[PDB]
């Protein structure tokens, strides 16, 4: 019955597949089409023989394993996309039409129907499979009757009758929010359309509108740009991806129903883009510290995941108008063009998304200007993102506190992310491929960069924990200067350390004090564990003298500096130790497989060479202190360390401070309320984090008490002498 419902479904098909936009003369489109051709070809030659068949596909035959249901229906969706694509060799193919129809019927009878109960993961039964069924039926609606479409979607109403909750048929349902809530839309809004059910469409849209509300607690988007999911996990880069990706697909359809969403309610989407997503995108890569367990998926490395967000942003820009549309187009364009490592088209999986990107990149009317410097203090999720446009490097600080979980290990994914939030840092430089090409399965999980830990063995079965302390946070002064601290205690309460960071425009100082260890395990701080490029080797210098690193660890006592020299100055990394320190370094090939950190991934061996720098802490009360200076050549680095000779103000159990004489900026962390006199110019009076700038006889102050998550009147925390 061609009606308004089918009209909406046509729009939906144009969004999730876009065959109407296909052009065989379009190189990028032909590439996606050919990819679908091969997938359909493979599925057809392996699908089971309707003569006493026990399954459709042998590799997805154990229907006790819920993932097999979703994988099975997704193969049918691929067939639907090609049977409706005029340029596919399967266009209107009678055998494919019958295969989809017969497969739907078979699964309906023996595997997935209203009489079944959830076996395995609820997600497959309520989101993955319903979405695949909806899309298959929508795309091939001209090959199914309304009665058949209602028949194959009855099961969706059984497992997902309520647009506000998921797991409704289990003994522990939950409130749908964020990414999940958006998927609720892709399940019930589309099913509603297919079933011509007005109440389902309207009630579901009403539920979805909740996603536009910013929260000050719990899961969702925060005013400061943070995004929390799974109760207390920083998750902008995975669940937030799903949210923006899925919502941008749905909106064009929703806005054409009889229950469009108010334009002012949707205004917060622009806030997510500018506050939450943009800061996490550096040279086309989505910062891993925001992606949770997804970092353990081989097909979803940083640049790939970034496209999930970018394609969503672009669709939103396309449905916008005037300057809002223009500014968003410019954001997408500059980010994509800055990525010389990843081909954006590799993750634009529909013809419309491809078409949109191509027009964007060729439209001289859309400005593409390098992004300016910024520094986001995501205090509500304990992450900080810094970007310096003049020098061209990004910096990510991954922490956690009494308010957030350190790492997420679930669904057998991210088995070794134990220390990815123990003060771990990320450096985004000229090597855009650093955290890609197998970084996650080959990096030594016991030596995550920036972390202070003991060498005790950890079990893959362990799960995340929150921090005993709430004293973790960042005080931001401006777009280039901020200070952070973390009252760190390790997983088994055998080691502590006051870890602080001083972001000073073109460098970051790392200070650690009060390092205590009560175990018999050895303790140390990993200064860095950098993944190398066989094409761009580094020349290593210690105290400005060339060193030859080996697989075997070598000790370097009385170290003043370490410099990693590349042919490209934008890959250079220098470490300046305020006080001569005893460190050790090595360069070795590290092997591993994605399956080691994610049960569902390939066991194929992967390997990468890593340069590891460490500093042992053999006595209680130990400390470390060094300045990370990226993107400058050797001579400039050497010149800079002399300028910084007296930059360390203090690094003890109650006070940690670094001074940037060139900028006239101080970074200060106080663990108690004693009066601290700084550089004989002023005093700071309260426990907390400070970033101060002197401009003449004037002083600009940025104070933050991480525990109460509040600042305070200037006179309460600052006094000029
Ligand atoms: C955010 C997240 O990790 N969601 C899990 C699912 O992963 C997402 O799957 C899809 C999709 O369209 O199916 C898109 C995303 O890129 C990917 O992160 C999936 O792993 C699912 C399996 O049960 O569990 C979700 O929590």
Curated annotation (Swiss-Prot):
Disulfide bonds: none annotated. Its EC number is 4.2.2.1. One of its GO terms (biological process) is carbohydrate metabolic process. It is found in: Secreted, Cell wall. It is a peptidoglycan-anchor. It catalyses: [hyaluronan](n) = n 3-(4-deoxy-beta-D-gluc-4-enuronosyl)-N-acetyl-D-glucosamine + H2O. The active site is at residues 180, 230, 239. Keywords: Cell wall, Lyase, Peptidoglycan-anchor, Secreted, Signal. GO terms for cellular component: extracellular region. GO terms for molecular function: carbohydrate binding; hyaluronate lyase activity. Its main location: secreted. Belongs to the polysaccharide lyase 8 family. This is Hyaluronate lyase.
